Design an enzyme around this catalytic site. Sequence first.
Site, short mmCIF file in Angstrom:
data_model
loop_
_atom_site.label_atom_id
_atom_site.label_comp_id
_atom_site.label_asym_id
_atom_site.label_seq_id
_atom_site.Cartn_x
_atom_site.Cartn_y
_atom_site.Cartn_z
N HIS A 238 24.54 30.37 45.28
CA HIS A 238 24.06 28.97 45.33
C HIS A 238 24.01 28.48 46.77
O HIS A 238 24.67 27.46 47.10
CB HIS A 238 24.91 28.09 44.43
CG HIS A 238 24.56 28.24 43.00
ND1 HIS A 238 25.34 28.96 42.14
CD2 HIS A 238 23.52 27.76 42.29
CE1 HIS A 238 24.79 28.90 40.93
NE2 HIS A 238 23.69 28.15 41.00
N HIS B 192 17.85 20.97 45.53
CA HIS B 192 18.28 20.86 44.11
C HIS B 192 19.73 21.33 43.92
O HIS B 192 20.30 20.98 42.88
CB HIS B 192 17.33 21.62 43.17
CG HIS B 192 17.62 23.08 43.05
ND1 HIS B 192 17.25 23.97 44.02
CD2 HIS B 192 18.26 23.79 42.10
CE1 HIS B 192 17.64 25.18 43.66
NE2 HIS B 192 18.29 25.09 42.51
N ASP C 106 13.94 27.49 39.25
CA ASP C 106 15.40 27.67 39.42
C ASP C 106 15.81 29.08 39.00
O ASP C 106 16.72 29.65 39.63
CB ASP C 106 16.19 26.62 38.65
CG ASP C 106 17.63 26.49 39.14
OD1 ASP C 106 17.92 27.00 40.27
OD2 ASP C 106 18.42 25.85 38.42
N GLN D 48 22.98 39.69 30.63
CA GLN D 48 21.63 39.40 31.18
C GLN D 48 20.59 39.43 30.05
O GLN D 48 19.71 38.55 30.04
CB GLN D 48 21.29 40.37 32.32
CG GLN D 48 21.90 39.98 33.65
CD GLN D 48 21.46 38.59 34.07
OE1 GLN D 48 20.35 38.40 34.56
NE2 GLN D 48 22.33 37.61 33.84
#
Length: 313
Positions: free
Chosen positions: A68, A106, A217, A269
């Site tokens: 991030h 964001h 995103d 995943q």
Amino acid sequence: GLMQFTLPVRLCKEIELFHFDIGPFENMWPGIFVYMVHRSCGTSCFELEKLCRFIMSVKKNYRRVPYHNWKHAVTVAHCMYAILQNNHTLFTDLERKGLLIACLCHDLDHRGFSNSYLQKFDHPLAALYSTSTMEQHHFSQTVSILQLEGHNIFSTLSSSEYEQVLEIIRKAIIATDLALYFGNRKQLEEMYQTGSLNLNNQSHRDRVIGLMMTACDLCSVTKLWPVTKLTANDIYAEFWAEGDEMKKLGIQPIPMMDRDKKDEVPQGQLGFYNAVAIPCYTTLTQILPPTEPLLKACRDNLSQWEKVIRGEE
Ligand SMILES: COc1ccc2nc(N)c3c(C)nc(-c4ccccc4Cl)n3c2n1
Ligand SMILES: [Mg+2]
Ligand SMILES: [Zn+2]
């Protein structure tokens, strides 16, 4: 006025593609973002001196966490740039301005921990913002940077244009809270199927912009397999650190976050591609047909994760 950013030939061509990787040279990323603003918006959208100062303040307010980070910020802005360029005429001047800035900001000042961990830690941000905790923080941090002297890239907008663009950025950043994505896509699904979807309906645009923000995103699942596979290690390094911190609070983490259970990652995943990414790019490809390469790339990587499980890599 007459000062264009140009990129080397390979970047100039690949940057137009959804699956573009911005590369390991950090010092080229600001230039890559400005290039994208100039082609998506115009060379007049923003005063270059102010935009450059805004970018470097945004970069400073991203942390050195495995995923991030500043690279995630620029990666997410490039996917928004690819969506906007492949859908030239569907978006307003205000929207193209707002959304690239929203994507860059964001995840501002992210610590690599989820909204759940903040609440269980009892972090002050969790008392201040009861839902979309980090996302309300990300918007707060964007406003703070816009209000630094010489940082207001929007200063030349009319009073009401300024209010509209900050309203686009707020909704855009709040929509990156994945807990809000599930209901947003369900609604967009119903509207598309019963044919009630209407892009002149502001509340409908808001929903579509939110799905675009989810799509950008998650865009690490839409790269070439090697990029996607190597990014998943950064994503899991945060998950396992969060898992460790859960254990420190005497709470057994979900297996996805427990570094003892790394074996369960490929199956994890899979669930994420099936429960989140595929449905996200499917609904997006229905509303915005030119975004199909994201769905195709995502299905390609789903297939790569299936291969890891079957022991073929
Ligand atoms: C949130 O739970 C999960 C679980 C598995 C993920 N696997 C990914 N490949 C992935 C990607 C590209 N982005 C996110 C994500 C989305 C929104 C916020 C934070 C994150 Cl980490 N995720 C994942 N998120
Ligand atoms: Mg986020
Ligand atoms: Zn993000």
